[PDB]
Amino acid sequence: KPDILWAPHHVDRFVVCDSELSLYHVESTVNSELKAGSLRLSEDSAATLLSINSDTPYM
Amino acid sequence: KPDILWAPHHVDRFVVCDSELSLYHVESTVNSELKAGSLRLSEDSAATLLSINSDTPYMKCVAWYLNYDPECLLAVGQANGRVVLTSLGQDHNSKFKDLIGKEFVPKHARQCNTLAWNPLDSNWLAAGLDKHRADFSVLI
């Protein structure tokens, strides 16, 4: 069961749980074009991947 | 079989392979006291742990990438035959993250005996595995 969790003390950090766990960070993209490797979370919001972990199979 | 490997392009970086793989860095300690959490490699040498990885249980074969980018890139082949490309450096600007975590699985489950990279072309990996009944043993 994949799930997304925010950072307890950081508003821009999130983690998504799957076969590989991906920790991403949120950045603004209103005044800038689509950054390379950044996922357009919204029209003016961009999420940049911070870390990837494959250390937990069958989580 | 635990083993220690140096960084191909860095003289201060090393990796030790065990149940957990530890990437450490070497620093001087002649004019400074024993730093907290630093292993006294010699009388005037100190090694500071850089990263720890538990992502490879029952590791069988280990190799290090030749090219400079990305840094701290290794390939680990397991007993089941899966060969996974892992990274240990703090690389927030990976050139090709698609290869990060890339895994090759043998057609038939067999143990990988050895793995190596081609020096002339860093994009070629040669791996020799266990003897299958009627299948090739060396894959590039």
Q: 3-state secondary structure string, B89-109?
A: CCCCCCCCHHHCCCEECCCCC
Angstroms from A20 CA to nearest CA on chain B: 9
In chain B, the residue whose alpha carbon lies closest to the alpha carbon of A36 is B93
- Closest chain B residue to the Cα of A19, Cα to Cα: B101
User: 3-state DSSP call for residue B68?
Assistant: coil
Check if A57 contacts B (Cβ < 8 Å). no
Show the tokens assigned to B28.
């001087």
CA separation, residue A26 to residues A9, A12, A21, B1, B36 (Å): 14, 5, 16, 42, 34
Phi, psi of B98 (to 5 degrees): -65, -35
Tell me, what amino acid is at B139?
L
Contact check, Cβ <8 Å, B92/A37: no
Q: Which amino acid is at B12?
A: D
> Least CB-CB distance to B101: which of A37, A50, A52?
A52
Half-sphere CA count of B61, side-chain side, radius 13 A: 22
Tokens 């057609």 appear where? B107
Residue B107, amino acid: K
Burial readout A13-47 (b: 16 or more C-beta within 10 A, e: otherwise): ebbeeeeebbebbbeebeeeeeeeebeeeeeeebb
Q: Rounded CA gap, B56 and A59, in Å?
A: 15
Chain A interface includes B55 (CB < 8 A) = yes
Residue pair B59/B75 in contact by the 8 Å Cβ criterion = no
Query: Rounded to an integer, what distance in angstroms lies between the CA atom of residue B112 and that of residue B9?
Result: 27
**Does A49 sit within 8 Å of B101, measured CB to CB?**
no
Sequence-distant (6+) residues with CB within 8 A of A48 are A24, A25, A26, A27, A35, A37, A38
Contact list, A52 vs chain B (CB under 8 Å): 97, 100-101
Method used to determine the 3D structure = cryo-EM
**How many other C-beta atoms can be found within 10 angstroms of the C-beta atom of residue B106?**
19
* Euclidean distance between CA atoms B11 and B73, whole angstroms: 15
- Token output for B97: 């993250």
Resolution (A): 3.7
Return the closest-CA partner of residue A52 out of B63, B65, B117, B53: B53
Tokens of A52: 């990837």
* B2 contacts B17 by C-beta, under 8 angstroms: yes
B-contacting residues in A 16-35 (Cβ below 8 Å): 20
Residues B93, B120 contacting (CB under 8 angstroms): no
Residue B98: partners with Cβ closer than 8 Å, 6 or more residues away: none
Decide: helix, strand or coil at residue B47.
Answer: strand
B137 Cβ contact list (under 8 Å, min separation 6): B128, B129, B130, B131
Residue recorded with tokens 């989580």: A59
Token pair recorded at residue B15: 């990796």
The single-letter code of the amino acid at B126 is A
